[PDB]
């Protein structure tokens, strides 16, 4: 925008942190002016603290109000634990099976250096193991991966490629372990 | 296990733009459409299991607006330093000929949260089927955004996501072909 | 089942 005017930005974060489900919960409230956090409430501290001089008047005014501080501490139960239980079925317990395909990167004769591709996409959650098998045996040497890609979508995608010399009678299996499966998925190329 | 639920709001002057959204482990659960006072579920499924009183978001934004004015006055009208975005362009899934996919333009690591995004197919700006997420939070207080274009994959068509942002000295033009 | 927001507080003036 050819518009030259100065901008002023206010951001607020309430962060609920869950360990072993709701066994341990931590609440972080964060006031952020022009990308710099000024004041925060941390449930592990239980009061407001200036992160910069600009925040000092707000820490002091808020911490002044006993009943206010008492509710902010109770919010680990009345906000964090509550909202966790609201979303659990479709959030924490969300399982979406990956689509797994394997194909060569080049059609070429037997006995030649090839790249075999194992694309795994559409999956949730992010936790997953893809392992490469030659005739029954796994290998770790020539395994390259694009890592975990977030689609913005509540789905992830990944490639794991395998550098390999295909030989007469060789069967290659891509092995995917994901929380959605009662036991790993397997797709072959012969 | 380990989960994080974030309630993230912002207000920006002089644009008078405000957003309200909840985040679970880096995906959006919902945001509030301020104009229509409606909760917008990132997947429609979620609205079948849970509700949110959208009006609540407008009380928080009113107070965000009041706080932005106080902090502006306190800072003696010090403005934000523009941070330019990084742009990745990628596909929703692997790409097969004549099997409809979706093109993602991912825009990351930028503030303030105002960008202009254009989809160019063979040089023509295209608008058919386009959608976008809201401005998503990052731990460093910068923003992420997703822009989406459904399309038919072919060797005929070449793609560009064009991003404009105050932190850039010219528009970023990120390319995709098959 | 209903999500609850936490209220933003007004800064000192």
């Amino acid at each position, epitope marked *: 925008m050819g518009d030259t005017r100065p901008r002023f930005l206010w951001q607020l974060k309430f962060e609920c942190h869950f360990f072993n489900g709701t066994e341990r919960v931590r609440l972080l409230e964060r006031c952020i002016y022009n990308q710099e956090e000024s004041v925060r409430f941390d449930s592990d501290v239980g009061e407001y603290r200036a992160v910069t001089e600009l925040g000092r008047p707000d820490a002091e005014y808020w911490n002044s109000q006993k*009943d*206010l501080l*008492e*509710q902010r*501490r*109770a*919010a680990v*139960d*009345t906000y964090c634990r*509550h909202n966790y239980g609201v979303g659990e079925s479709f959030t924490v317990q969300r399982r979406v099976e990956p689509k797994v395909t394997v194909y060569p990167s080049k059609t070429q004769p037997l006995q030649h250096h090839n790249l075999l591709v194992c694309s795994v996409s559409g999956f949730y959650p992010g936790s997953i193991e893809v392992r490469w098998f030659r005739n029954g045996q796994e290998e770790k040497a020539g395994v390259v991966s694009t890592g975990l890609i977030q689609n913005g979508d509540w789905t992830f995608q990944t490639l794991v490629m395998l550098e390999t010399v295909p030989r007469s009678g060789e069967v290659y299996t891509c092995q995917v372990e994901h929380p959605s499966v009662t036991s790993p998925l397997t797709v072959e190329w012969r | 296990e380990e989960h994080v639920i974030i309630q993230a709001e912002f207000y920006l002057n002089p644009d008078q733009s405000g957003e309200f959204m909840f985040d679970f482990d880096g995906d959006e659960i919902f945001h509030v459409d301020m104009a229509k*006072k409606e909760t917008v579920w990132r997947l429609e499924e979620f609205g079948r299991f849970a509700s949110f*009183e959208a*009006q*609540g978001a*407008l*009380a928080n*934004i*009113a*107070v965000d*607006k*009041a706080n932005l004015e106080i902090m502006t006055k306190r800072s003696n009208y010090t403005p934000i330093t523009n941070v330019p975005p990084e742009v990745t362009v990628l596909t929703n899934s692997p790409v097969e000929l004549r099997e409809p996919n979706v093109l993602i333009c991912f825009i990351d690591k930028f503030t303030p949260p105002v960008v202009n995004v254009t989809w160019l197919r063979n040089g023509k700006p295209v608008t058919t089927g386009v959608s976008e997420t809201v401005f998503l939070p990052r731990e460093d207080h910068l923003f992420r955004k997703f822009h989406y274009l459904p399309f038919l994959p072919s060797t005929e068509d070449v793609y560009d996501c064009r991003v404009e942002h105050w932190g850039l000295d010219e528009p970023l033009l990120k390319h995709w072909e098959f | *089942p*209903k999500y*609850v*927001k936490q*209220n*933003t*507080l*007004k800064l000192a003036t």
Partner: T-cell receptor
């Protein structure tokens, strides 16, 4: 007083548009109009969380409001009927469920 | 459906005796709860407020109320009824939605 209502006492004939005014000095974003009747408690008519923000309560029918400024929240009886005879209370709320009620408007609608 | 139920429009207590006013609530959400008093020919005054901080809430003049989740109750008590306790009392709930829904109210009559 933070919250002041005008008028404090009004008689009106049925079929008339009449306006009750609430004004506040604590610069609170949340404002509310309630009516109180014997045996029914306070019922919420309309509420506002920002300038030009309007939300229907339990009993909005026969009423309208405006929030042109932060300091003021106006209630209008569109076409006054006798069962709109009540004590009307404007309220503001802070950010932590601290309500301040106005001292009330006694409105009597006669046929 | 956020609601609060008070029992009895008009109730009596002997001067000097324990005051007990009943309120039961209905909420999908851990609530804010309130008791207000309206003294004759005046407005509404907050007596006390439940915020989940503590199950025993204390207010002005010896008023107290105990939150009991298991019987969804928030009964107001005062140790000794005075003539000046004659008033209307209202219980109120918010399902954390920044609006207070009121019960129908109980007027307390003090028998001298």
């Amino acid at each position: 007083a933070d919250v002041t209502q005008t008028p404090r006492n009004r008689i009106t004939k049925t079929g008339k548009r009449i306006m009750l005014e609430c004004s506040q000095t604590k610069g609170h974003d949340r404002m509310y109009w309630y009516r109180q009747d014997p045996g029914l408690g306070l019922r919420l008519i309309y509420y506002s969380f920002d300038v030009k923000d309007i939300n229907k309560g339990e009993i909005s029918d026969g009423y309208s409001v405006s929030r042109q400024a932060q300091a003021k929240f106006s209630l209008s009886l569109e076409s006054a009927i006798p069962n709109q005879t009540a004590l009307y209370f404007c309220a503001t709320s802070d950010e932590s469920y601290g309500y301040t009620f106005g001292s009330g408007t006694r409105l009597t609608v006669v046929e | 459906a956020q609601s609060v139920t008070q029992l009895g429009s008009h109730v009596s207590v002997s001067e000097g005796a324990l005051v007990l006013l009943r309120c039961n609530y209905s909420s999908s959400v851990p609530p804010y709860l309130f008791w207000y008093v309206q003294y004759p020919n005046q407005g509404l005054q907050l007596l006390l407020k439940y915020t989940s901080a503590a199950t025993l809430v204390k207010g002005i003049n010896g008023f107290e109320a105990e939150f009991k989740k298991s019987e969804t109750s928030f009964h107001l008590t005062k140790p000794s009824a005075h003539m000046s306790d004659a008033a209307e009392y209202f219980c109120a709930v918010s399902e954390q939605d920044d609006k207070i829904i009121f019960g129908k109210g109980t007027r307390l009559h003090i028998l001298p």
